[PDB]
From a paper:
TatD proteins are a large family of 3′-5′ exonucleases conserved from bacteria to humans that have been implicated in DNA repair and other important DNA processing functions. Here, we describe the nuclease activities of two of the three human TatD paralogs, TATDN1 and TATDN3, which represent two phylogenetically distinct clades based on unique active site motifs. We found that in addition to 3′-5′ exonuclease activity associated with other TatD proteins, both TATDN1 and TATDN3 exhibited apurinic/apyrimidinic (AP) endonuclease activity. TATDN1 and TATDN3 adopt a triosephosphate isomerase (TIM) barrel fold found in many metallo-dependent hydrolases, including the E. coli AP endonuclease EndoIV.
Importantly, dAMP1 is oriented with its phosphate pointing into the active site and coordinated by both Zn2+ ions. ZnA2+ partially occupies two alternative positions and is coordinated by Glu112, Asp222, the dAMP phosphate, and several water molecules. We speculate that in TATDN1 MeA2+ is bound only when DNA is present since it partially occupies two positions and mediates interactions between the DNA phosphate and the protein in our structure.
Author numbering: 2 to 296
The structure:
């Protein structure tokens, strides 16, 4: 109502929003209630993140259910082994066709990038090869990138510098790197995304203060990245939500982050930067429109 937000990365396809945890139905599907709470807090658009071919199809199909919903097409670093399970050239084409044939709903290439803290899911050589291959998607579709970078700044920056002309721009989401890393990404005319995972350490809060407002975007990565009392920014949260450990109607569930929690991320960022929250929220929204909704 007061604030307006675009969640640049919400996993609305995650089974937890249908009441399924570890393959077990624990409670009634409350996805519509989760969506409603976010709308009431000011979420105007939801970018449903795709993380592989099938999850990109699932994200688009859910996005087709609501005019506030949009999706991404790409392969997450942890899932890049899918390229070589079959034909990597065919897998790439299937992503391209899905993106190219659904302009309007599909607004970004991604999630893609590098995560050298999850090499148990996909080794470095495969991650490096298939992240760089997705620049074929960005160059052909003219869609901006939704990027992930964990424990991989040098390798990531090398790929981005060599391939920057093959994308129209993009955002490094869940940013958790140094001031120098942020500066190197800003020097490539990229944006920096902040969710709860961006705000866990004292150093994270200091790095945020070095980034201009017009270079930031906001997100939840729900159901992940919920802010805990052990995180450095938790003291700055101003809004709490009715929550239960065991599901009840009208309540969030403990440990399940939601899009409505994007207001907590805004409260932390505004407090850390000592910035008016409405001015910062409007700037974050406008940055997101400029990159992903330029129409
Ligand atoms: N296992 C593990 N180790 C280290 N860091 C991790 C791990 N899982 C998630 N993450 C971090 C990576 C991003 O900063 C954020 C969201 O990951 P996303 O993939 O966007 O949901 O969480
Ligand atoms: N191993 C590891 N390292 C870093 N970030 C991770 C890891 N596993 C998950 N994550 C990310 C995504 C989770 O939702 C959140 C848990 O951080 P918490 O502080 O437990 O609430 O942080
Ligand atoms: N390919 C994959 N197979 C299975 N699980 C996967 C994969 N990629 C990411 N994950 C998820 C589960 C981990 O707990 C989490 C990191 O904590 O990332
Ligand atoms: N435990 C987890 N499983 C899948 N994706 C994640 N992203 C962050 N944490 C995750
Ligand atoms: Na607080
Ligand atoms: Zn990510
Ligand atoms: Zn995520």
């Amino acid at each position: 109502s007061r604030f307006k937000f675009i969640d640049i990365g919400i996993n609305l396809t995650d089974p937890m929003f249908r009441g399924i945890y570890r393959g077990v139905q624990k409670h009634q599907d409350d996805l519509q209630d989760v969506i409603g709470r976010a709308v009431e807090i000011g979420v105007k658009k939801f970018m449903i993140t795709g993380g592989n071919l099938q999850d990109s199809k699932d994200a688009l199909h859910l996005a087709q259910t609501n005019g506030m919903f949009f999706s991404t097409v790409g392969c997450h670093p942890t899932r890049c082994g899918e390229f070589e399970k079959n034909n990597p050239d065919l897998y790439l084409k299937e992503l391209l066709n899905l993106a190219e044939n659904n302009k309007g709903k599909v607004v970004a290439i991604g999630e893609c990038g590098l995560d050298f803290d999850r090499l148990q899911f996909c080794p470095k050589d495969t991650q490096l090869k298939y992240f760089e291959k997705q620049f074929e998607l960005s160059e052909q579709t003219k869609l901006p990138m939704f990027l992930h970078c964990r424990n991989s700044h040098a390798e990531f920056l090398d790929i981005m510098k060599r391939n920057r002309d093959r994308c129209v721009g993009g955002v490094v989401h869940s940013f958790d790197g140094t001031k120098e890393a942020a500066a190197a990404l800003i020097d490539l005319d990229l944006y920096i995304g902040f969710n709860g995972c961006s705000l866990k350490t004292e150093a994270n809060l200091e790095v945020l203060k070095s980034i201009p407002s017009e270079k930031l975007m906001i997100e939840t990565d729900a159901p992940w990245c919920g802010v805990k009392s052990t995180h450095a920014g938790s003291k700055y949260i101003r809004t709490a939500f009715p929550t239960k450990k065991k599901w009840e109607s009208g309540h969030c569930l403990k440990d399940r982050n939601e899009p409505c929690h994007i207001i907590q991320i805004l409260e932390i960022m505004s407090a850390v930067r000592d910035e008016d929250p409405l001015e910062l929220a409007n700037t974050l929204y406008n940055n997101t429109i400029k990159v992903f909704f330029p129409g």
